[PDB]
């Protein structure tokens, strides 16, 4: 399909990889005894390996000639769960972190001892700001509009 | 020998003179600051370039500046 | 400018260039740099104050 | 004198004699006075 | 296979290029 | 203790050994010499250029002579795929009998030639050891010409003035038209006249060239306008190079792709290429104004280029006087262009091999690519260093400013913080995520579950490959489609040759790529961005910063500003070059590692080894380095030795020089001055040695000198060890 | 701190080790006193140290020291 | 580092190993220390390159953590 | 317990607690839904 890849559900090398891993795990399982915790752990390993391979097969995942899932990150929504949705999730979380950090910096920057409140965090104010970051996309595009997001010329510059 | 220049931002706090390890700087009368004194560099032939003088300078970007130049047995700190 | 006034540093070779400081005292004598300004941010040498000329400081409204 | 004797004539010549004379000249030059 | 005459005259011409090199070297001064 | 640094009285008065060290390292900085004028500067640079070109020509003549005398060029002509080219003979008295026997080739111990000169000279039509001797003779004559010119232009009546040196329009017209176009025209003349018949078995030498027609019709179609006649009857697909079997009569053709036998570009293709380039450059060489009232005045062109809305300030008004009066701006521009050009040479001479039987010479392919990429990195770092030098010592803010507003160059110092911050952001972004994906693959594969690897298909780059005709990724885009206008347009000119070459598994033309290629390309991008960040930061911050707002008053290269203000180690612009050299070496190492591993897997046939193991770091460490280092380290063992013994010795030598660089970089001065003082006391207080005393007081190397020496050791060891590894691994793995 | 470290070592020998199995077969069982939780596929680190045990092989020689001390039980 | 390298190679090459029932001593490496530890190339090849095989081939096995720590320590 | 709570509000203790909590919920997500190469949706 895309880039010459093929779905992993029809990739023979993918099933060969699964079979080889299961065979190695079973051979390891053979050298232990009865329902002893080592055998239980190896059986859990086998079950998890089978579940992971089955989930990857039924996941709209494209496999190359090596039988490994390749990620299609050109931007198409068909393979949108590989990069685009995790990209949105990370952008949300990281914007949350950056927004709460910036808000805390600007909030304790207007107190008597701004530097003290950076090594000794005001946990009440920190908790107040941190749970308010869920609106960071909206807060950012409400502070940029008001001109409160960017400094203009009070920023310092070197000699040249 | 290195070159040492004094600039009128001098506040005459004498910290440069009392930090020179080779007696290069001295305090001379002046009328450009409250202390009425300014640093001078009349013995730059003994300047070693250690820059202790400008480590003790409190003015914003220094009032004593050391420009390293030609080397001499005195400026290289050679006891041999 | 006077004691307690807020000024912007116009000296380019300054750790507080384009920044705002608080005037501690403006000397009335014939010194070259009478304006003494105190800043909240220490420079690279650790000091937080410096003497500036009358044309190197601009009062903030 | 064949052409195959040229390496044995030249390699010692260059790689030993030229360093010696070059060192002599360079040392004399850099140790001069005025 | 090149002859002795071919190598010899190439060596002689190389010498001439060497005398031209020191003349340029000395003209670029001490 | 005097008279050695004739150009510097300040150094000549130094009583220490520092005078000798600094005399070497400041000999070519003519602008800093005592009693210095601009006219003398340009004249000395001109003479030095002449001497340099003479050196280059002498080096080429030496290569030609040594191939003609001690090589096996004539034997290699008759069997280019089995006979290994010989560079020159070996006479080393330290050889044992075993070393003599192992290095013995034909009549004397000799070195295989990895420069690819055999294929290059064979392609351009050389078939005899007397053709090489003629070339060596002619090149020594040219070297003599250049040395005579260099001497002449220092004579009183022949020394050019500043106006002649700064005559931009004349030099551009002549350089472009004459140099580029006319040299391409002469090269097309040689290509056709000599090379084309020599590839077809007809000898065209310096005797029968006024009587052997390069084309049967003989200049009639050119004047008649029937230029298609020179393309009729090209070389067939069964043509044996250097022989008349299956040859043709055409001299200028479009064929595309490679020769079916030599697996290299068609000679008629390259002749046509050089003819087109010659015409284009000769035309473009008439642009600028000279004594005949027509042309361009580049000052006016630069001044008139200000966007009307206004986003580049006042435009390029002050750039003409800025560039003309600065030799470091021009040097930086030339070095950047040369670096890009040699990167292009490296990237195209492996994908599109231009010389006969060079594709099957794997060691020379690897050596050429590595050599040109390292030269490219050096040239780029030099361009940025000279830009920084221009900022320090040649940049004038007044010239680049008109009534407060700043021109296009002066505005680069206004948003310098923005530029540096965004370079830092890109570098951190790429490094964080490339290392994250690589370490994720490392951990996931190590835990025995390679299916959980993050493998991103390089769809953007595969899209480009499909656009050029590669039907491997099922894109059907531009030239992978037979119905697209891009394909119908050239279906009769060069697609059949181009498609037959791009869609071939044995070529290096557009090598198939996978997730490993994606990750390594991102690593390369990170290296480029970080090297650019260091160099741009050093260039822009050269004139000053917050830690040193008067850095321009201390020059381009100074040790520091002292321990005050928190510490100012490596604060000069020279130190930025010094730090960026490590990153350039690392980036070129990544590029060359990627190229060499990809091509080793391609040549050996186990391309699946790269496609699987290149996604994680341990894959690289185990399957490239550890795997291919086995032939190299066994160049000599307690049992014997091979012709690869010299490469193992060079491997160890490079490691040793690298670690001596580590000495000079980690341990700084001050620790070496006191030790030297102890040694001085020991010498002064011992009998039978008091009779001998130094003239220059022995002192430790200066901080900047120590940084330079450590960098030189680091770089020399790096280059030597990698050259030894790549060459020995290719030779010992691929027969 | 040192006493806490020693207490941790002895606790791992008592609870997460094959010391009893190693006592009966010192020459064929590899000493292991740290088992690894089964997360993110890291359970491969639990090696076949012998004695019906899975874990990381121990190179600190605590098993031999405990045997020299006469410790025969966990 | 040199001391521990000397110890490791010398022990593996000339002390440690197995003893056959008839009394024949076979070592881990095979006595290569005596003749190949006298050159830097010998140390590079017969010790570093040779005994680093287990570290680089540890991926997928229970010693994979050692390969990961090898790479991380290089980093 | 007025200065002890202020000590717990210091940068190292707060960073250690936050990173321990963060690693904790990451590890537990990866335990309950292991081997997640793509988005679950
Ligand atoms: C939490 C506040 C915060 C915010 C909003 C930013 C924002 C930014 N940083 Mg930054 N930075 C921060 C903290 C922060 N940083 C810290 C703590 C460090 C020290 C490691 C850095 C080091 C740093 C460098 C070296 C660079 C940036 C850059 C940047 C810019 C591009 C984004 C980037 O590259 O991220 C960079 C982010 C990191 C390197 C990781 C940050 C480390 C953690 C995740 C942040 C700290 C969280 C904090 C403890 C939360 C406490 C708040 C709570 C008490 C309420 C952007 C302006 C780049 C730039 O200039 O581009 C324009 C750049 O080159 N930053
Ligand atoms: C720059 C080009 C160059 C280089 C690197 C070499 C390199 C070498 N030559 Mg050589 N050679 C060259 C050009 C060159 N040749 C030319 C043009 C000729 C024709 C005259 C010869 C003729 C020649 C002979 C006859 C022999 C060598 C030999 C050798 C080897 C031992 C060195 C020696 O004895 O030199 C001796 C070299 C000469 C007598 C000729 C002079 C070399 C050129 C003209 C000078 C180039 C100078 C260079 C540009 C910069 C000089 C730097 C200096 C100021 C320090 C060595 C591999 C020997 C060999 O093969 O041993 C196995 C040997 O017997 N060469
Ligand atoms: C191009 C460079 C070059 C060349 C051509 C040589 C050549 C030689 N080296 Mg040498 N070497 C060099 C660089 C070079 N070296 C460097 C840079 C190093 C340091 C890394 C060494 C370190 C080195 C060592 C440690 C040794 C050599 C030895 C030798 C000799 C080989 C052994 C042999 O069979 O001779 C046998 C030698 C003889 C039969 C006698 C030769 C004595 C000299 C060289 C003859 C010179 C004649 C001269 C014109 C006399 C002038 C007149 C005088 C009577 C007043 C040979 C003369 C070996 C040797 O012979 O030691 C002396 C040896 O042990 N070299
Ligand atoms: C037709 C007349 C002519 C010719 C042939 C030359 C030739 C030359 N001049 Mg020159 N000059 C001329 C007229 C001419 N000049 C005039 C009229 C003036 C006065 C205004 C000058 C003033 C002058 C100065 C002041 C200097 C020279 C120098 C040089 C030399 C440059 C070094 C060299 O060998 O480059 C050889 C280069 C080539 C053979 C071609 C390079 C090929 C490039 C790298 C490939 C590019 C291809 C492509 C664009 C790559 C990019 C890919 C693309 C997709 C973008 C060269 C021999 C310099 C020198 O060394 O002096 C001795 C020097 O300092 N000249
Ligand atoms: C055609 C290109 C070109 C030209 C004309 C120049 C010209 C100049 N450069 Mg420049 N440069 C270049 C390329 C170029 N460079 C490149 C590519 C780089 C990046 C590496 C640099 C980096 C650079 C720096 C950082 C500096 C210069 C400086 C200078 C100026 C003085 C040079 C000097 O004193 O030399 C001195 C020459 C030496 C010290 C000799 C060094 C020789 C090296 C160490 C190699 C020798 C070892 C050799 C390989 C031995 C082999 C070992 C063996 C065992 C294998 C001069 C205007 C200096 C300056 O002040 O400019 C104003 C300066 O600070 N350049
Ligand atoms: C393996 C060795 C190594 C590594 C990892 C780095 C990493 C870095 N160097 Mg660096 N450097 C090195 C060796 C190394 N250097 C050496 C030997 C030199 C010669 C002195 C330099 C000289 C140098 C200069 C001059 C500059 C850098 C810069 C950078 C940063 C580039 C941005 C980046 O990749 O962010 C991603 C960071 C990483 C991938 C590494 C840290 C991430 C860890 C693993 C996080 C772990 C958290 C627990 C980064 C921190 C540039 C910089 O600061 O850019 C902002 C810069 O200006 N370095
Ligand atoms: C000081 C030395 C030391 C060291 C290095 C360790 C290290 C370890 N112990 Mg441990 N332990 C120690 C002392 C030590 N312990 C002592 C003194 C005791 C007696 C109270 C214990 C009792 C103990 C038990 C009962 C368990 C461990 C477990 C563990 C492992 C997982 C720890 C974990 O995830 O906690 C995370 C801790 C936090 C997030 C708190 C912050 C780890 C290898 C566990 C293990 O191996 O599981 C199989 C386990 O179940 N330890
Ligand atoms: C700080 C983050 C964090 C979070 C959000 C959770 C969340 C959870 N843990 Mg938990 N846990 C954590 C850290 C964390 N754990 C740490 C640091 C340890 C010690 C290593 C444990 C040890 C632990 C055990 C032993 C159990 C849980 C269980 C649970 C689940 C029910 C309670 C829940 C999903 C329980 C569960 O769901 O298992 C069935 C359970 O039995 N946790
Ligand atoms: C920086 C690059 C990078 C990226 C993009 C990833 C991405 C990934 N890694 Mg990975 N990894 C990295 C670096 C990276 N890693 C490094 C440096 C290491 C070495 C320590 C590892 C070691 C590693 C292991 C050992 C494993 C992964 C796994 C995974 C996957 C599961 C992620 C997960 O738990 O989601 C689920 C968790 C979240 C989405 C957390 C966010 C949830 C919040 C609470 C949502 C709340 C808001 C609504 C994912 C594809 C696992 C896997 O299955 O691979 C396929 C796995 O087993 N990685
Ligand atoms: C510091 C400085 C300097 C330097 C700088 C530098 C060094 C730079 C570099 C630069 C560079 C190095 C750049 C590069 C560039 C490149 C480019 C710009 C490219 C382009 C390309 C293109 C555009 C292409 C296109 C295309 C495609 C893609 C496809 C095919 C076809 C075509 C052609 C269409 C100087 C001295 C000047 C001055 C001072 C400052
Ligand atoms: S360097 Fe600075 S301190 Fe040392 S002598 Fe000269 S002036 Fe006084």
């Amino acid at each position: 399909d895309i880039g010459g890849l093929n779905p992993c559900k029809d990739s023979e090398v993918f099933q060969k990889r699964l079979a080889k891993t299961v065979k190695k795990l079973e051979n390891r399982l053979k050298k232990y005894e009865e329902g002893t915790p080592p055998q239980i752990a190896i059986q859990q390993q086998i079950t998890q390996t089978k579940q992971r391979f089955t989930r990857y097969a039924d996941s709209n995942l494209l496999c190359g000639n090596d039988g490994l899932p390749h990620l299609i990150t050109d931007g198409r929504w068909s393979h949108g769960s590989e990069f685009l949705l995790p990209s949105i999730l990370f952008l949300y979380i990281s914007g949350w972190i950056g927004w709460v950090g910036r808000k805390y910096i600007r909030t304790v920057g207007q107190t008597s001892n701004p530097t003290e409140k950076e090594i000794i965090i005001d946990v009440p104010l920190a908790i107040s700001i941190m749970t308010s970051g869920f609106l960071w996309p909206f807060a950012a595009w409400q502070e940029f509009l008001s001109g409160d997001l960017i400094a203009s010329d009070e920023t310092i510059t070197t000699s040249p | 020998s290195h070159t040492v220049k004094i600039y009128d931002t001098c506040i005459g706090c004498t910290q440069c003179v009392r930090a020179c390890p080779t007696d290069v700087l001295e305090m001379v009368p002046w009328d450009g600051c409250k202390a009425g004194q300014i640093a001078s560099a009349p013995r730059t032939e003994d300047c070693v370039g250690c820059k202790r003088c400008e480590t003790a300078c409190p003015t914003d970007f220094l009032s004593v500046r050391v420009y390293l130049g030609g080397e001499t047995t005195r400026s290289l700190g050679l006891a041999y | 400018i006077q004691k307690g006034s807020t000024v912007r540093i116009l000296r380019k070779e300054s750790y507080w260039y384009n920044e705002s400081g608080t005037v501690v005292v403006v000397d009335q004598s014939k010194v070259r740099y009478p304006v003494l300004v105190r800043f909240t941010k220490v420079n690279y040498a650790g000091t937080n104050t410096n003497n500036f000329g009358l044309n190197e400081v601009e009062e903030v409204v | 004198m064949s052409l195959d004797l040229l390496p044995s004539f030249f390699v010692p010549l260059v790689g030993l004699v030229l360093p010696l004379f070059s060192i002599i000249g360079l040392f004399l030059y850099i140790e001069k006075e005025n | 296979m090149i002859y002795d005459s071919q190598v010899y005259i190439a060596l002689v011409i190389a010498v001439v290029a060497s005398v031209l090199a020191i003349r340029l070297g000395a003209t670029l001064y001490n | 203790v005097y008279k050695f640094p004739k150009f510097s009285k300040a150094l000549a008065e130094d009583p220490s050994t520092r005078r000798i060290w600094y005399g070497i390292a400041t000999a070519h900085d003519f602008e800093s010499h005592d009693a210095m004028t601009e006219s003398k500067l340009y004249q000395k640079i001109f003479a030095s250029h002449f001497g340099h070109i003479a050196i280059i020509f002498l080096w080429t003549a030496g290569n030609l002579f040594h191939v003609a005398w001690q090589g096996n060029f004539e034997a290699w002509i008759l069997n280019p795929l089995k006979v290994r080219p010989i560079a020159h003979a070996i006479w080393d008295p330290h050889f044992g009998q075993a070393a003599y026997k192992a290095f013995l080739k034909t009549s004397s111990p000799a070195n295989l030639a990895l420069s690819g000169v055999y294929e290059w000279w064979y392609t351009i039509g050389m078939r005899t050891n007397n053709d090489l001797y003629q070339g060596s003779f002619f090149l020594i004559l040219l070297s003599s010409l250049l040395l005579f010119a260099g001497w002449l232009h220092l004579q009183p009546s022949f020394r050019p003035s500043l106006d002649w040196f700064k005559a931009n329009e004349y030099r551009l017209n002549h350089h472009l038209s004459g140099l580029f176009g006319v040299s391409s025209l002469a090269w097309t003349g040689h290509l056709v006249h000599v090379a084309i018949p020599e590839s077809r078995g007809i000898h065209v030498g310096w005797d029968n060239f006024l009587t052997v027609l390069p084309h049967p019709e003989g200049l009639t179609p050119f004047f008649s306008g029937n230029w298609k006649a020179y393309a009729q009857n090209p070389d067939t697909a069964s043509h044996i190079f250097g022989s008349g079997e299956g040859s043709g009569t055409a001299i200028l053709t479009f064929l595309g792709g490679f020769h079916p036998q030599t697996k290299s570009l068609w000679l008629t293709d390259m002749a046509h290429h050089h003819l087109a380039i010659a015409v284009l450059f000769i035309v473009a060489g008439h642009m600028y104004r000279t004594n005949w009232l027509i042309g361009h005045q580049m000052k006016l062109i630069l001044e008139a280029h200000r966007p009307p809305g206004g986003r580049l300030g006042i435009g390029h008004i002050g750039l003409y006087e800025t560039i003309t009066n600065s030799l470091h701006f021009q040097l930086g521009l030339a070095l950047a262009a040369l670096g890009v050009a040699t990167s292009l040479t490296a990237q195209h001479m492996y994908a599109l091999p231009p010389y006969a039987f060079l594709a099957s010479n794997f060691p020379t392919q690897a050596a050429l690519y590595t050599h040109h990429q390292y030269i490219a990195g050096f040239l780029m770092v030099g361009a940025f260093a000279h830009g920084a030098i221009f900022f320090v010592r040649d940049y004038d803010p007044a010239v680049n400013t008109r009534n407060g507003e700043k021109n296009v160059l002066a505005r680069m110092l206004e948003h310098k913080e923005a530029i540096i911050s965004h370079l830092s952001w890109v570098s951190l972004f790429l490094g964080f995520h490339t290392l994250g994906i690589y370490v994720h693959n490392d951990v996931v594969v190590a835990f025995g579950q390679p299916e959980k690897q993050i493998l991103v298909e390089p769809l953007f780059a595969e899209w480009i490959q499909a656009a050029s005709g590669k039907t491997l990724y099922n894109f059907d885009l531009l030239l992978a489609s037979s119905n697209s206008p891009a394909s119908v347009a050239s279906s009769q000119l060069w697609l059949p040759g181009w498609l037959s070459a791009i869609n071939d598994g044995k070529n290096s033309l557009f090598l198939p790529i996978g997730p490993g290629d994606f990750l390594v390309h991102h690593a390369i991008a990170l290296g480029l961005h970080t090297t650019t960040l260091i160099l741009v930061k050093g260039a822009l911050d050269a004139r000053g910063s917050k830690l040193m707002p008067d850095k321009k008053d201390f020059g381009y290269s100074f040790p520091c500003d002292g321990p005050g203000r928190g510490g100012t180690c490596d604060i000069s612009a020279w130190d930025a070059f010094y730090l960026a050299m490590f990153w350039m070496l690392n980036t070129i190492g990544w590029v060359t590692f990627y190229w060499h591993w990809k091509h080793l897997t391609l040549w050996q046939g186990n391309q699946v080894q790269f496609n699987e193991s290149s996604n994680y770091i341990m894959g690289w460490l185990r399957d490239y380095l550890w795997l291919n280092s086995s032939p190299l380290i066994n160049g000599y063992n307690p049992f014997g030795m091979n012709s690869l013994s010299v490469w193992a010795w060079m491997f160890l030598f490079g490691h040793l020089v690298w670690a001596t660089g580590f000495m000079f970089l980690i341990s700084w001065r001050g620790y070496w001055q006191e030790l030297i003082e102890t040694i001085v006391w020991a010498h002064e207080r011992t009998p039978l040695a008091n009779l001998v005393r130094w003239k220059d007081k022995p002192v430790a190397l200066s901080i900047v000198q120590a940084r330079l020496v450590g960098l030189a050791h680091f770089t020399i060891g790096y280059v030597l060890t990698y050259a030894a590894f790549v060459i020995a691994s290719t030779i010992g793995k691929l027969g | 701190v040192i006493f806490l470290w020693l207490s941790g070592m002895h606790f791992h020998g008592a609870y997460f080790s094959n010391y009893s199995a190693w006592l009966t077969n010192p020459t064929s069982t590899k000493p292991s006193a740290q088992i690894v939780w089964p997360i993110v596929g890291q359970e491969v680190l639990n090696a076949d140290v012998g004695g019906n045990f899975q874990g990381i092989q121990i190179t600190s020689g605590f098993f031999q020291l405990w045997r020299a001390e006469g410790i025969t039980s966990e | 580092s040199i001391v521990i390298f000397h110890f490791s190679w010398k022990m593996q090459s000339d002390v440690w190993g197995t003893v056959s029932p008839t009394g024949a001593v076979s070592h881990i490496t095979g006595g290569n220390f005596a003749q190949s530890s006298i050159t830097i190339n010998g140390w590079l090849r017969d010790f570093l390159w040779s005994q680093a095989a287990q570290v680089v081939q540890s991926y997928g096995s229970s010693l994979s953590a050692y390969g990961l720590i090898f790479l991380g320590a290089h980093f | 317990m007025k200065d002890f709570l202020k000590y717990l509000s210091t940068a190292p203790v707060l960073l250690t607690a936050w990173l321990t909590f963060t690693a904790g919920f990451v590890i537990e997500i990866n335990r309950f839904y292991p081997d997640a190469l793509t988005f679950p949706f």
Side-chain angles (χ1 to χ4, degrees), chain B residues 50-51 54-55 61-62 65-73 76-80, chain F residues 13-16 18 548-550 554 561-562 564-565 673 676-677 680 697-699:
Chain B
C50 78
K51 290 178 175 281
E54 43 194 16
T55 318
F61 189 44
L62 283 71
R65 206 55 169 125
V66 172
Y67 305 96
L68 305 192
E71 307 280 329
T72 318
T73 178
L76 276 161
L78 297 192
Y80 56 90
Chain F
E13 302 196 298
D14 201 319
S16 75
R18 171 191 188 273
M548 203 180 184
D550 68 339
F554 283 72
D561 205 21
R565 313 195 295 284
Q673 190 43 51
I676 277 175
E677 293 179 353
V680 159
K697 287 156 185 249
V699 301

Side-chain angles (χ1 to χ4, degrees), chain F residues 424 427-428 431-432 435 526 530 533-534 579 582-583, chain H residues 75:
Chain F
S424 163
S427 306
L428 288 160
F432 277 146
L435 190 72
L526 158 73
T530 311
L533 160 76
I534 308 153
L579 294 172
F582 300 107
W583 260 98
Chain H
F75 175 87

Side-chain angles (χ1 to χ4, degrees), chain E residues 6-7 9-18 20, chain F residues 53-65 132-148:
Chain E
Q6 289 196 295
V7 183
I9 190 167
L11 279 152
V12 171
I13 294 316
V15 159
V16 170
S18 70
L20 280 154
Chain F
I53 305 177
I55 283 177
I56 285 180
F57 277 4
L58 280 168
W59 158 74
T60 317
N63 296 342
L64 281 159
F65 172 77
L132 307 157
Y133 175 77
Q134 286 182 357
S136 193
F137 202 100
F138 185 65
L139 282 187
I140 296 184
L141 287 194
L142 290 181
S143 300
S144 307
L145 294 174
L146 292 145
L147 293 168
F148 200 102

Side-chain angles (χ1 to χ4, degrees), chain F residues 434-546:
Chain F
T434 313
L435 190 72
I437 300 309
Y438 264 112
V439 173
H440 160 83
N441 289 349
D442 291 331
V443 171
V444 165
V445 171
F447 286 168
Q449 313 161 332
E451 66 272 0
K452 291 152 53 145
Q453 277 173 96
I454 288 180
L455 313 170
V456 184
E457 193 82 5
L459 304 158
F460 303 162
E462 293 170 356
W463 199 65
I464 298 191
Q465 304 208 334
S468 301
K470 179 174 296 285
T471 61
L472 183 64
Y473 309 110
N474 310 142
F475 272 126
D476 198 69
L477 174 67
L478 288 164
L479 290 194
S481 297
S482 310
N483 309 284
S484 159
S487 311
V488 187
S490 45
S491 63
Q492 311 291 319
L493 288 180
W494 65 76
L495 294 175
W498 176 260
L499 291 189
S500 194
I502 192 170
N503 292 309
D504 194 70
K506 280 75 178 174
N507 294 337
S508 300
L509 203 162
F510 272 118
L511 279 173
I513 52 184
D517 306 82
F518 168 92
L519 263 188
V520 70
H521 281 80
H522 283 233
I524 286 160
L526 158 73
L528 292 197
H529 287 92
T530 311
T531 316
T532 303
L533 160 76
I534 308 153
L535 289 166
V536 166
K537 183 258 174 202
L540 297 180
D541 273 334
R543 302 181 46 84
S545 55
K546 292 323 288 203

Side-chain angles (χ1 to χ4, degrees), chain F residues 273-300:
Chain F
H273 158 64
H274 294 101
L275 184 50
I277 286 306
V279 170
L280 175 84
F281 269 112
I282 290 172
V283 160
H286 297 46
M287 176 158 169
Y288 307 110
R289 190 209 201 187
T290 54
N291 312 326
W292 297 281
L293 303 178
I294 53 154
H296 280 280
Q297 290 179 183
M298 324 164 64
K299 175 163 163 293
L300 311 186

Side-chain angles (χ1 to χ4, degrees), chain G residues 1 4-9 11-12 15-16 34-37, chain I residues 20:
Chain G
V1 166
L4 179 68
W5 166 72
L6 278 185
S7 173
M9 295 299 102
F11 202 95
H12 273 84
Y15 273 92
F16 310 114
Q34 169 195 348
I35 57 148
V36 173
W37 278 329
Chain I
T20 311

